[PDB]
């Protein structure tokens, strides 16, 4: 007769890492600057800046991959477009899962899931300028140490390779 | 009175080409009539325009090339230089220009497949081929002192006779190059010369409220259709099933079964557009296919808007209501009624 179901959302997600300052905000503004993507603890909400209304919501429960992945992990960054390749986004989680999702449409049940190979490293941040990608990772005085890799996608193997640059 | 100098739906009735003046230069633009595409994608404004780089240069005639017939959709534009421009709307450029030897302006044009006929202000006929891009033949028929209108009778898959009118209407045989029959036309110059069916073509003149339905084979006036005001445009549905005429006062008159007291018939249904505040919005063109009617009006200054309505169910006297800006209090989504920011918290006041 009765059934239990989650309805509303939760707190906005944040980069809950003490050392990083000025990089706490993970929300991104689209390239055309017409909508803002904010990750929550249980979804990703796309708000339209002009009308100030949530045009789209991507719930992790609705998707099977997101339900398995996030439902502990958290999004470490969102990058506009798709690295592998006009409304695509690439989500990097702390463990290393890379997920290509789409807003402005209907969410696909089989996104382009990938996985960066990290050896006892917690992904902390990623960034790019023009096609070039670097990833910062945390490894272990109560003070963490950081390592900086170069991330590239090889089309032949369809995998993300990481090459050490700094520490 | 209307910024749109000329307008013309495509044969399918899904896109409208209109010519307007920007400063001192005419620009030609195509807009989609339907609110949404068959795929369900919402229709959007088309900013691309074809500018005539010369102020003197003007468009005198516009004719669509049937979208289904040809791979690329084209609109054929007659100009006052005496040359015809074939315009591919997608490339937004004039692919080819048919030039007559003379410089007289083109009064009318018509098309049947590859055939293309026009008339100059010198009263000279010309024949052209779209596939071959050549001027086949040109001639002048005697007793055709003026020629404002040209229409080709749809007989089979070839052209055998042409309808022409200046103030009276004439039927001419191409091979014989002579008049066959003459119909007593209007006092004023003829403005519309469409052919409704076989042996029945309608005729209308400038500043006239009467349309004459003539029998091609006999030559007698079958009926005279009357509008409440001067007629500007005309659209015929099916095979004489319905006729819609855009009056000069901005109304639309529909004639239901005009070909079935009997001599003179009046329009059966009248359609108007009036805004919520009270201003009347004139209609400058319309299209009627089987059971739906497309009405076009101008908002802002030159922006065309469209509405699709099923004229069968509409009552006899019907006024479309449209929301146009008038004394709109300007609401910003980032502010409330009192101008306070939405993010701001409400203060405590006892």
């Amino acid at each position: 007769q009765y059934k239990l179901s989650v309805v509303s959302g939760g707190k906005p997600a944040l980069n809950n890492l003490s050392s990083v300052t000025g990089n706490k905000n993970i929300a991104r503004l689209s390239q055309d600057q017409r909508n803002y993507i904010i990750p929550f603890n249980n979804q990703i909400k796309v708000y339209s800046v002009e009308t100030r209304q949530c045009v789209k919501t991507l719930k992790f429960a609705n998707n099977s991959l997101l339900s398995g992945i996030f439902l502990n992990e958290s999004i470490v960054k969102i990058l506009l477009g798709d690295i592998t390749v006009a409304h695509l986004i690439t989500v990097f989680t702390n463990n290393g899962h890379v997920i290509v999702l789409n807003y402005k449409g209907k969410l696909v049940e089989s996104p382009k899931h990938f996985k960066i190979s990290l050896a006892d490293e917690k992904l902390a941040n990623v960034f790019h300028s023009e096609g070039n990608y670097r990833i910062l990772t945390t490894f272990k005085n109560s003070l963490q140490s950081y390592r900086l890799y170069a991330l590239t996608f090889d089309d032949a193997k369809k995998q993300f390779e990481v090459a050490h640059q700094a520490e | 009175d209307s910024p749109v100098l000329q307008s013309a739906y495509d044969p399918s009735g899904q896109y409208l080409c209109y010519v307007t003046v920007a400063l001192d230069k005419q620009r030609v633009g195509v807009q989609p009539t339907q609110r949404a595409t068959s795929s369900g994608v919402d229709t959007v404004w088309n900013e691309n325009f074809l500018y005539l780089e010369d102020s003197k240069l003007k468009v005198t005639c516009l004719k669509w090339v049937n979208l289904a017939s040809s791979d690329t959709v084209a609109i054929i534009l007659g100009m006052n230089n005496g040359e015809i421009w074939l315009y591919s709307v997608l490339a937004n450029e004039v692919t080819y220009k048919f030039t007559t030897g003379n410089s007289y302006e083109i009064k009318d044009i018509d098309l049947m497949g590859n055939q293309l006929w026009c008339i100059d202000s010198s009263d000279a006929f010309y024949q052209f081929d779209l596939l071959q891009f050549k001027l086949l033949q040109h001639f002048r028929i005697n007793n055709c002192v003026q020629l404002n209108k040209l229409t080709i009778v749809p007989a089979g898959d070839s052209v055998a006779q042409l309808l022409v009118a200046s103030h009276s209407i004439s039927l001419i045989d191409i091979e014989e190059k002579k008049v066959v029959m003459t119909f007593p036309g209007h006092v004023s110059p003829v403005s519309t010369l469409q052919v409704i069916t076989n042996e029945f073509f309608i005729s209308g003149a400038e500043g006239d409220r009467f349309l004459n339905v003539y029998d091609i084979h006999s030559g007698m006036t079958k009926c005279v259709l009357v509008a409440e005001s001067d007629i500007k445009e005309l659209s015929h549905s099916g095979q004489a099933d319905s006729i819609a005429v855009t009056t000069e006062d901005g109304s639309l008159e529909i004639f239901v079964d005009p070909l079935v007291g009997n001599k003179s018939k009046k329009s059966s249904k009248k359609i108007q557009i009036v805004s919520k505040d009270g201003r009347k919005v004139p209609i400058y063109n319309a299209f009627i296919n089987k059971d739906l009617l497309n009405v076009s009006w101008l908002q802002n200054a030159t922006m065309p808007y469209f509405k699709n309505l099923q004229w069968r169910e509409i009552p006899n006297e019907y006024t479309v209501e449209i929301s146009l800006n008038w004394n709109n209090k300007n609401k910003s989504a980032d502010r409330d009624l009192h101008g306070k920011d939405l993010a701001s918290a409400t203060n405590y006041v006892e």
Partner: protein, 493 residues
């Protein structure tokens, strides 16, 4: 970002006898003028029409006072004996008056020289003369003959109708609104008698018993009539023929009574009733005829009147005293080249597609103490609290705000005896009030704990604590005493 909240003025819990919206309206009848007449002013009446002048009857003369000027503009002295009324007609063109001789004189209002009509109603005195409100042509007269004749202006030789049946003096006459045929008379028999002019008349349809001599009968509404006699006024319903309410808060015999409706007051309707004890009091018919205001005068009040509903100007409250005094209380109500150059300011965008408004409404100017608090001037905000001519409640707020902000020691550091005395002077007075007693204790506690050393070396401060000690001890006795009356009061219950 949000606009800064305004500092909220301190408001303690309500005390008894707060000002009411009805009182705040009637206090505005401020300007008081006392005029002295030769004899008691018996009747007062207001012209129904603009400018709404009012006529006072006193001794052998009738005077009309200007509403705006509040002075006599016309005088009717043609009467030889005492005059007993000055009512106007509904049109306001005529005013009728009665005499002790029994003669009824109708003059043109604002033309004392002309007499339009003179009627000998009876040989006995004619105390009441009133025009019929619905019908202008018919004039009513009541005399000591105990017959209330109904006259016609056209036929002045015989009355139209002679209502009788009263066994004592008839000094009151009323016309029921919406019932032109009905006429009400009140005699010193204590009976209010209703007559129908449509019928034969001369016999009342019914009589209502007031049990005391009736001094005035007034019709407040089409179905209710209020009659004042003896020491109380009672309101009767004609449909039920029984008294709905009775109010006897007066001490002497109520004399005159007037009713005003649909005027700009909070109360839709008002009933003013003179007392003969010096009191004229306002009652509201919408709240069961409960008292809402009052005035007191030097002597017994024989007549009262208030400006009509449509006064269209300054309102008036008039009271008439047997000493001959008349009391009036009033509620008062470039170049063409340049303009063509600057011409668009009047336009409000009535013909435009879009109207956009972003001007913020002008907020009330903030006071000095509020500006200092906003700018974090704790010490200067304290100084502004104790300045000459500062509202006591407004001084209490800044003290509470600084306490609320947690800035009580911070406001008291850079101070000596010279700049501490203003705070102690107010504390000497603020300790008495119940509202500011607790706040004074907090501030006086800190200053003692923060300036103990300065106290010893400064003599003038010392006396400020001797006398402050005296007063707080006095407040202790009052607070102990209030507990004792509390204890005994619990015993009674």
């Amino acid at each position: 970002s949000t606009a800064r909240p305004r500092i909220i003025t301190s408001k303690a819990p309500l005390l008894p006898q707060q000002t009411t919206p009805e009182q705040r309206y009637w206090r505005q009848y401020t300007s008081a003028q006392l005029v002295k007449e030769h004899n008691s002013v018996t009747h007062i009446s207001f012209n129904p029409q603009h400018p709404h002048d009012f006529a006072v009857t006193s001794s052998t003369r009738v005077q009309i006072f200007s509403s705006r000027t509040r002075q006599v503009i016309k005088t009717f002295s043609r009467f030889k004996d005492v005059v007993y009324s000055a009512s106007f007609r509904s049109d306001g063109k005529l005013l009728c008056a009665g005499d002790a001789t029994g003669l009824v004189s109708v003059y043109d209002s604002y033309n004392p020289r002309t007499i339009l009509l003179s009627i000998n109603a009876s040989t006995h005195p004619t105390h009441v003369t009133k025009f019929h409100t619905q019908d202008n042509k018919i004039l009513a007269t009541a005399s000591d003959d105990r017959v209330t004749r109904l006259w016609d202006i056209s036929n002045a030789y015989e009355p139209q109708l002679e209502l009788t049946g009263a066994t004592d003096y008839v000094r009151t006459l009323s016309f029921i609104p919406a019932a032109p045929h009905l006429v009400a008379t009140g005699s010193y028999d204590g009976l209010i008698r209703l007559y129908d002019t449509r019928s034969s008349g001369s016999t009342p349809i019914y009589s209502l018993n007031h049990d005391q001599p009736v001094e005035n009968v007034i019709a407040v509404s089409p179905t209710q009539i209020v009659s004042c006699g003896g020491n109380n006024f009672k309101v009767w319903d004609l449909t039920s023929n029984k008294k709905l309410y009775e109010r006897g808060n007066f001490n002497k015999a109520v004399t005159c009574l007037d009713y005003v409706e649909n005027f700009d007051s909070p109360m839709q309707s008002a009933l003013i009733a003179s007392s003969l004890d010096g009191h004229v009091k306002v009652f509201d018919p919408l709240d069961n005829f409960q008292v809402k205001f009052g005035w007191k005068f030097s002597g017994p009040v024989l007549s009262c009147a208030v400006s009509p509903s449509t006064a269209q100007g300054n309102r008036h409250l008039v009271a008439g005293l047997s000493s001959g005094l008349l009391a009036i209380r009033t509620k008062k109500k470039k170049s063409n080249n340049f303009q063509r150059m600057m011409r668009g300011s009047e336009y409000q965008g009535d013909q435009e597609h879009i109207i956009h408004n972003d001007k913020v409404r002008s907020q009330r100017r903030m006071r000095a103490f509020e500006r200092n608090i906003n700018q974090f001037k704790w010490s200067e905000a304290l100084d502004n609290a104790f300045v000459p001519g500062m509202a006591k409640e407004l001084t209490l707020t800044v003290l509470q705000e600084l306490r609320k902000r947690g800035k009580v020691r911070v406001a008291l550091y850079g101070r000596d005896e010279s700049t501490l005395e203003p705070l102690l002077n107010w504390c000497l007075k603020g300790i008495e009030d119940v509202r500011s007693a607790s706040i004074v204790a907090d501030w006086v506690a800190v200053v003692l704990e923060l300036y103990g050393n300065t106290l010893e070396s400064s003599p003038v401060l010392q006396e400020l604590m001797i006398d402050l000690k005296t007063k707080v001890r006095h407040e202790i006795h009052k607070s102990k005493e209030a507990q004792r009356i509390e204890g005994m009061l619990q015993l009674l219950t």
